[PDB]
Amino acid sequence: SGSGSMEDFVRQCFNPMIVELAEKAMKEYGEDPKIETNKFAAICTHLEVCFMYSDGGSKHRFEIIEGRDRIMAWTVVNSICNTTGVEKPKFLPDLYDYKENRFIEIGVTRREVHIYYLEKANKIKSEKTHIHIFSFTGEEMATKADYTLDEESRARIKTRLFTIRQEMASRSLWDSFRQSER
Ligand SMILES: O=c1[nH]c(-c2cc(O)c3c(O)cc(O)cc3c2)ncc1O
Ligand SMILES: [Cl-]
Ligand SMILES: [Mg+2]
Ligand SMILES: [Mn+2]
């Protein structure tokens, strides 16, 4: 589901490190990036947001968990849980917030945000894990309506997501993409 024009877009739009991390994530499930090109973009976007979110508070307020191999990912997680004694999650989250001492799952959606907020809450079966959704239309939604970052930072993120929708639109990739969301 998608085009080599979408493939080309991904390679032009996203930082090479992000591109390679997504190619690796997909291949680990037997998916081919130059075929399932809508997932390629989807995975790339979720990564970029995660990295943007981490560089949004103070220095080293967040530990990044997404983008890491499973062993290092669980190394970080297991260590944080030892140093802080917070309930160890059953699935790998995306960040840890040292300041509010909780994990964060981050969602990015091309549908309505309330819908994606539940599927996460149900899959993550989040005990103490904080959830935070974003859309490409400027919608956001967080646990107990706690948005963690300041607005200048949250807006830096929403504006980037908007930016991507548009560039996709000009290239006529957006509906396929909006359509293909499982
Ligand atoms: O929140 C997260 N989401 C994802 C994730 C993984 C996928 O494999 C996806 C896919 O194949 C299609 C799709 O439309 C969206 C996808 C999102 N990975 C890590 C997270 O923290
Ligand atoms: Cl990384
Ligand atoms: Mg993740
Ligand atoms: Mn996530």
Numbering used by the authors: -4 to 53, 73 to 196
Give the original sentences from the paper that presented this experimental model:
Each asymmetric unit consisted of one PA-Nter molecule. The proximal site was fully occupied by the manganese ion with a strong anomalous signal (up to 2.75 Å). The manganese ion lies in the center of an octahedral coordination sphere including four protein atoms (Nε2 His-41, Oε2 Asp-108, Oε2 Glu 119, O Ile-120) and the C-5′ hydroxy and C-4′ keto groups of 36. Compound 36 binds in the PA-Nter domain active site46 with a similar coordination pattern to that of luteolin. Additionally, the C-7 hydroxy group (luteolin numbering) of 36 formed a hydrogen bond with Arg-134; in the PA-Nter–luteolin complex; this interaction occurs with Oε2 Glu-26. The C-5 hydroxy group of 36 also formed an interaction with Nζ Lys-34.
Influenza viruses contain a single-stranded, negative-sense RNA genome complexed with RdRp, which comprises PA, PB1, and PB2 subunits.
